[PDB]
TrEMBL record, chains A, B:
This is D-3-phosphoglycerate dehydrogenase. The gene is LOC103645840. Residues 132-286 form the S-adenosyl-L-homocysteine hydrolase NAD binding domain. The chain holds residues 83 to 387 of 626 of the full protein. Belongs to the D-isomer specific 2-hydroxyacid dehydrogenase family. It is found in: Plastid, Chloroplast. It comes from Zea mays (Maize).
Amino acid sequence: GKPTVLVAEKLGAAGLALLREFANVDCSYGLSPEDLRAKISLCDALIVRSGTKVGRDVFEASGGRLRVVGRAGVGIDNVDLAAATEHGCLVVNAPTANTVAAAEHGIALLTAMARNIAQADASLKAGKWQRNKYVGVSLVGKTLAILGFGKVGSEVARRAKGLGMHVIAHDPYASADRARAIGVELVSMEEAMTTADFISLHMPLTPATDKMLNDEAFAKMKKGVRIINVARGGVIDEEALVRALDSGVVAQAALDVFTKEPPAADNKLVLHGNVTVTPHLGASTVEAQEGVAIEIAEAVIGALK
Amino acid sequence: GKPTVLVAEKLGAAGLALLREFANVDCSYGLSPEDLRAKISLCDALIVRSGTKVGRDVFEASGGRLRVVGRAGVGIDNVDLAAATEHGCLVVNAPTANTVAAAEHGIALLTAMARNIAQADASLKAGKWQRNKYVGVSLVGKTLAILGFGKVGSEVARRAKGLGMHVIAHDPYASADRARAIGVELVSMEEAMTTADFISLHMPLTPATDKMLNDEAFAKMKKGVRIINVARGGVIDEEALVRALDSGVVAQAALDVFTKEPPAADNKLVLHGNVTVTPHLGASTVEAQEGVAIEIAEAVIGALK
């Protein structure tokens, strides 16, 4: 009746001040596998965002006590979730506030990839002024294709049919009901490769869809198609987007996630004209700061009853 | 039988093909006010986008014959209509194809400003990596006050409520039915200064509005308000936008249009962290390139009946 929780990484003071109301809080951020292993032993719950090595060894190390683990935010594959339920351990994540701030930061990438809000604000801050150089295109009647109709890339579609596009998605595991409701149509894979002016990636990087965007799939697309990637940057074979952009098969690209974050400074899509990159800012809104902080706080507490 | 039309400025290729169908077409782009005067004398129609030396002096030089003159684009005040009024001249503009893709490039300035898509893509192409500097804001439950419920600001409300915002607009001239129809509430002026998380300018620069936004104006606003000017930059007393972006009353500002274009290099709004400046790109989309070209072509062809 004074439970105890390890905060492994920095966390929103909205949240922490909840936990300090129903627990004891260890805010020892960033701990070597050792400090964790020695700490885990003595604490009923652990909370982590995509950065703490949680896996078999951390699980064994605790021996009872550790009843529930809270992952802060988007992904989950942080934790070896197999050992979780195995050593009888609960696993709760925080995905409502980080989906918003995600589907938001993609809309912001698509609209601003289309009008060159970057390279223009570049040349004008750089003393230049070439209106003929940075002439946008028009996300209205333009078919947008979405790969991975998850929670993110559906709250994207929700938004893009508000901008007025004809939006389609492709994911075998998406209920034709929830897609037809939000206003989307569910269509085949090559119907989404070909017939698209805008492409929005939302596929989990697995050995099943890795390097999917190679050079066999760039030819299928309509030439001049535009790509926005905000969910697992490995799914693109980056050295073919380096080449469909230079050649002209892909018109423009706007990438938030990468194969290796941070990509080396030579990295050819990071340094390029038709690209507009942000450094996994996907969920970086001050409202999903407080929002994920509070919602795990509320999750942990619930499962730690 | 064989009417005749002067094209003063470069005009879209589709429409020129339209004009050569029902006229002779002299595309004499960039005429000295003197050549204009001598030419106007012999032609039934003159067409001109934002930026041609038309006025009383040109009106008189033509002495009849010049029935109609078309402003290739949104603007209708490019010239002294008072003399066309006075000279039996007709006056036709392009009030639609440039309408859409201005509302568009408006939105895209709001969204790319919120998530710092410019200042971010910049420093990553600049070999930095600071996921913590370029932290956004979440345009969702947020109030967007649209100053001026023209055909521009309306169709920005259209998109903005689709990103899911609370949009109010204030222009004493828009029937509240045309407002409540698209889903927007009309309210007062100070209920737009004070309650706005986002302020979109769509005021034409009536003298009355020249330097409206001044330090009195900025003090009224909620601190943290973001200002997307995409209409006519004279309305902002730039020396004070600079001192609320600096002093932190204005959060960020996305500016497409300026007091004087192309501005002084050293212009503090042009060169500023919290400002995203594109250069009057408000129209530069190829669906309004061809779109305006063909609509005023259409517009003159009729007025020339």
